[PDB]
Design a protein around this ligand. Structure first.
Ligand SMILES: Nc1ncnc2c1ncn2[C@@H]1O[C@H](COP(=O)(O)OP(=O)(O)O)[C@@H](O)[C@H]1O
Ligand SMILES: Nc1ncnc2c1ncn2[C@@H]1O[C@H](COP(=O)(O)OP(=O)(O)O)[C@@H](O)[C@H]1O
Ligand SMILES: [Mg+2]
Ligand SMILES: [Mg+2]
Lengths: 126, 82, 74, 375, 160, 82, 375
């Protein structure tokens, strides 16, 4: 309940934030692992029918074109959603933004200066 | 005597500053009082306007109900003559 | 130009990704190196598509949060 | 709701875009169709100022915008702005992606073909809907009344058209389309207000004059008697408070603004009023269905909401028509959204479910598919 | 003020006595031991700053926890440590929003007591139920029962 | 020195006078500010009640206009009926 | 602090130069902008007598100097003295070399171009700053209030200007700049003090009259009643001790000096007071943003610190304005430094960080760059 307990609560919230950041990083690591595991397959092309290899390369190129088309469609949709989200956030900021701008206070000099000012000429050791 | 004179000068400085503080406080007090009177007048005007509007609304409600009843009676008569 | 804009995105992306591909003259080594380049392109496309799907999920979350704050604005 | 798929009943209109899912009673989102770029310079940095406010957002910042409607008279004159309006309607007012919903636009009769073809091309290429269908704005208003005959006068804000229908068979040779509508009445009111001293010029103040017209104007039962009464007594002068104070008093401008409908000579138009183009539209029909059309005259559209028009029009037609026929004017209280209610009913029908213009059909015949069997 | 309250609490009894010696240096002539606008104003005039009592009263209100309008020895200590500022910028709003979403595993747009206690169990430290209720009440001024984006932002407003 | 001590004495007299007047003015100013807050709150409540009454009166007038127009129309209709 | 780079928010003003680093609450050094050469001969040798005392040093030796302000009405009339003032401000009051700090000057609206161009040329050639930006003195005062709309009346000491702003879009056609300000009030007070016997003539005694004006004068709520009261009772006569004794008693000169603001006919100026130029500035705006400007009238600048002006101005505008609108006058206690606080806030913004006039840009286009996109 004390101010020490409030500092403990703040430190606990900071630790929770750090744990969430670590879990986000490990989730990204898992995403990379799963993406590498599930996506494609390596190719061995040693000493085969080279015209047949060329035809297989052409079919793979067609598949790559299809994948690129789908990727570009999803890319355009993602960009449009990003623009819409930016517009909505701008609307929210214009609605309830305003004078929530923080500032700092520096007119009051440190406690040592205040104490030496109140002591007068006595303040020499501290 | 010179020490007493210096203390006297310090006291006069303190006196002048205290007079400044007192006069500023008085001026703030009287200005706030004037604003208070003005707000009182404004509240009185708002009371007047609201009461007038309420009386208007009651009269409008009664006349509306009367005209509605007349309208329904004429509707029935129109259906009969149809 | 809207229909032209759709045709333009699709056709110009195709033209950027289309090349004069003559697999006949290439030997085994060049053919396999071209396949490796294609696999690198596939890796890039899949990585950016997964980034796009994660961005899509974040977009849905952001939309939900914006709706909640709109509700809180009354 | 759940599985399944609902249709989007959009209704472009001219002045108010009305949209909503099929099967409801009222449109979900109704907002003016105006796109206004800012016109001043702008000095605050980081305020998040956009380049174009559309829809109902530009009716609140209209003090520093230049609003411009993208639809002049039924036809669409500025395709980029119309595309922007549609995009806003789909994504922000309904929040449903168009990739998973059929659409049912509406179009005035006798409009240019290129407008309709461009509309379908946009809907299929940009928004990429599954299937869209374009319907005449008067047949829907006849659906909403629950009739199957009758001659409907749909006096919108862009254009007033008068489509007679009998037993479900429309009569294409008897459609009388007149280009006087709510916008011309707003301009004429703004022009006659200058006779008292009030000058409205800016495109933003046209909205204020529109509000005055909506809230104060009414149609006189007899014009000359009202002109004589307003010139002697002062029982008509109703006052109205501008968006900043300085109340104004409207005298005989009250019933002179909407009188233009019955005497289009006021704004210099040659044609006859809406009281006589209906009678002419009836007389072009066959001699055996005139009684039914006389008895089932339907009113629709926004501009037919003036207090006292359903009596003036009946009096005028009774004067014109033969004395034996009974003249009845159907004026439902839900006049403004009558077209959209009819659109919802039509989209909710099972028999209609195979009339949509499917996307594969458009891919095979191009945008000119709309004029074909799928009308 | 909260970080300053924590710093004063972290002082031992000896450090509190040293700060009370500082207090006596500051509060010379104070009737109630509380530095109202009078002593603070005379000290400011002595310092070379020429303020108005509004700023001092706002400093009090950030630290006046009872509503008495005075600044007692504890509140005076917060006034003392107010001479230096470090709680600035509130960390990063984007970071806090992302970590709040991570906290909101159900993505409801607000934080529930269930996920809060789940994260507390993950930390595992001793929990003060009264302080938890106070935090929930302060966040839920609208009385919704769940901590929101603005609610938790104002929880960390001015905090570090 | 005698004159300086006289000055010290009158200084202390002025100090006491000024400080007492200052305390009285501060107390009165606080009371006035409290009363001003009270009157301002009452004024704001009256203003909002007036706004509500305005909205009510407007709605009533709209309804009355509609009903009156329908009444006049049906009255003309009944005349033609007879 | 540490790494990184902070901006210098200087604010030339006319009467008090206010400066300080960006991101604080109050200016670091505030001192009068006067440069006074000695005028007598000087007989002591080796006393270390300089040739010109600037800033706050010449307010202590003013007994043997001839103080002369380098800024008359917003515009700068004596460029060498202004350069001296800037050099003092940078090197002795802040002790930061300008080679490592961006600067943000402020300028009144509707000022001559040559003044602004010479200002930027000096800042880039003599002091050699990295980048400087010039901002209108009213937009900053609107920043400090935390608003985004409102019409701000910034009655400084040189010139009083009244810039209306809505939603961040400034209205350039509604700026009403009037050249009555604190200096003319000082001269008029010095001129009416002669009616009791006190004659102040020397340019040094103008400072004494300024102190009298600051400490004693107040704005009357109603002018005629105060004139009648001061002519019967004696409850207004407040005394003041000159820098050498001989106390003076100011009678009805107390509220007659600042009354010139609301009746500029006193000093022979034709124009209307600050109570009516605000209403005229509002009425030039569009009809739909007048309510917001009425409700958010902002006061700033030093001269608006007279005790009782925020009530007189509200009474006057309420008399002029329509009875329905609510008139509210924002008068923050930190009025004097409002422009500088706003300047600090603007310089601390991240969105603003790319609007500075970088030195390479000046090298490519010359001093006329300030009128270009980088305003
Ligand atoms: N209550 C009303 N009274 C009078 N006129 C109205 C009223 N409501 C709308 N209007 C007029 O009708 C127009 C709206 O017509 P609407 O039916 O929306 O056109 P559209 O067919 O394009 O949808 C407005 O411009 C306005 O001038
Ligand atoms: N407390 C005060 N009461 C009355 N007038 C004042 C007060 N403080 C300053 N002034 C007047 O305002 C002027 C200072 O205005 P200021 O805002 O510094 O001008 P600038 O815009 O050039 O900075 C002084 O010349 C003085 O006449
Ligand atoms: Mg329509
Ligand atoms: Mg200024």
């Amino acid at each position: 309940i004390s101010a020490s307990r409030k500092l403990q609560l703040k430190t606990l919230m900071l630790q929770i934030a750090k744990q969430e950041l670590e879990r986000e990083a490990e989730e990204r690591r898992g995403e990379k692992g799963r993406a590498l595991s599930t996506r494609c397959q390596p190719l061995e092309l040693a000493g085969l029918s080279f015209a047949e290899l060329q035809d297989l390369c052409r079919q793979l190129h067609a598949r790559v074109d299809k994948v690129d088309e789908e990727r570009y469609d999803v890319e355009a949709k993602v960009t449009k959603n990003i623009t819409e989200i930016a517009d909505l956030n701008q609307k929210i900021f214009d609605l309830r933004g305003k004078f929530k701008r923080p500032t700092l206070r520096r007119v009051r000099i440190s406690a040592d200066a205040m104490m030496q000012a109140l002591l007068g000429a006595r303040a020499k050791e501290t | 005597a010179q020490k007493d004179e210096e203390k006297m000068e310090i006291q006069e400085i303190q006196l002048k500053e205290a007079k400044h503080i007192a006069e500023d406080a008085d001026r703030k007090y009287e200005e706030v009082a004037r604003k208070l009177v003005i707000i009182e007048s404004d509240l009185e005007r708002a009371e007047e306007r609201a009461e007038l509007s309420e009386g208007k609304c009651a009269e409008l409600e009664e006349e509306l109900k009367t005209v509605t009843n007349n309208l329904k009676s004429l509707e029935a008569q129109a259906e009969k003559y149809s | 130009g809207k229909r032209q804009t759709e045709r333009e995105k699709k056709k110009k992306i195709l033209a950027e990704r289309r090349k004069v591909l003559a697999i006949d003259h290439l030997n085994e080594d060049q053919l396999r190196e071209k396949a490796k380049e294609l696999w690198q392109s596939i890796y890039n496309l899949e990585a950016e598509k997964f980034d796009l799907q994660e961005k899509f999920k974040q977009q849905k979350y952001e939309i939900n949060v914006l709706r909640n704050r709109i509700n809180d604005n009354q | 709701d759940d599985e399944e798929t609902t249709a989007l009943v959009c209704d472009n209109g001219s002045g108010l875009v009305k949209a909503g899912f099929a099967g409801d009673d009222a449109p979900r989102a109704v907002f003016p169709s105006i796109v206004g770029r800012p016109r001043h310079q702008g000095v605050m940095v980081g305020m998040g100022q956009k380049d174009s406010y559309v829809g109902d957002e530009a009716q609140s910042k209209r003090g520093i915008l230049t609003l411009k409607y993208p639809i002049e008279h039924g036809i669409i004159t500025n395709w980029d702005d119309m595309e922007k309006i549609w995009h806003h309607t789909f994504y922000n007012e309904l929040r449903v992606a168009p990739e998973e919903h059929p659409t049912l636009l509406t179009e005035a009769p006798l409009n240019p073909k290129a407008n309709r073809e461009k509309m379908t091309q946009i809907m299929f290429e940009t928004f990429n809907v599954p299937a869209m269908y374009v319907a005449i704005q008067a047949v829907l208003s006849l659906y909403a009344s629950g009739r199957t005959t009758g001659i409907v006068l749909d006096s919108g804000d862009g254009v007033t058209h008068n489509v007679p229908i009998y037993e479900g068979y429309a009569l294409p040779h008897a459609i009388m389309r007149l280009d006087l509508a709510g916008r011309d009445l707003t301009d004429y009111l703004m022009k006659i207000l200058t006779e008292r001293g009030y000058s409205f010029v800016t495109t933003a103040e046209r909205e204020i004059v529109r509000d005055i017209k909506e809230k104060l104007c009414y149609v006189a039962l007899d014009f000359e008697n009202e002109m004589a009464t307003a010139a002697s007594s002062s029982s008509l002068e109703k006052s109205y408070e501008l968006p900043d104070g300085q109340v104004i008093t409207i005298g005989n401008e009250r019933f002179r603004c909407p009188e233009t409908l019955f005497q289009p000579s006021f704004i210099g138009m040659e044609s006859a009023g809406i009281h006589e183009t209906t009678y002419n539209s009836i007389m072009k029909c066959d001699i055996d269905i005139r009684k039914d059309l006389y008895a089932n005259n339907v009113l629709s559209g926004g501009t037919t909401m003036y207090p006292g028009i359903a009596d003036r029009m009946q009096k005028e037609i009774t004067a014109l028509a033969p004395s034996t026929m009974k003249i009845k004017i159907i004026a439902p209280p839900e006049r403004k959204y009558s077209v959209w209610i009819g659109g919802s009913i039509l989209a909710s029908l099972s028999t209609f479910q195979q009339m949509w213009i499917s996307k594969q059909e458009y891919d095979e015949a191009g945008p000119s598919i709309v004029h074909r069997k799928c009308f | 003020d909260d970080i300053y309250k924590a710093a004063v609490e972290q002082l031992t009894e000896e450090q509190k006595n040293e700060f009370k010696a500082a207090f006596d240096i500051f509060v010379l002539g104070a009737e109630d031991g509380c530095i109202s606008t009078k002593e603070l104003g005379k000290v400011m005039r002595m310092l070379g700053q020429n303020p108005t009592p509004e700023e001092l009263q706002e400093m009090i209100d950030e630290v006046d926890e009872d509503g008495s309008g005075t600044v007692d020895f504890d509140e005076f200590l917060v006034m003392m440590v107010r001479c230096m500022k470090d709680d600035s910028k509130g960390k990063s709003e984007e970071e806090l929003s992302d970590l709040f979403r991570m906290f909101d595993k159900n993505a409801d747009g607000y934080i529930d007591l269930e996920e809060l206690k789940i994260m507390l169990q993950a930390t595992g430290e001793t929990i003060t139920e009264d302080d938890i209720e106070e935090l929930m009440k302060d966040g839920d001024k609208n009385n919704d029962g769940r901590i929101d984006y603005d609610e938790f932002l104002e929880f960390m407003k001015g905090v570090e």
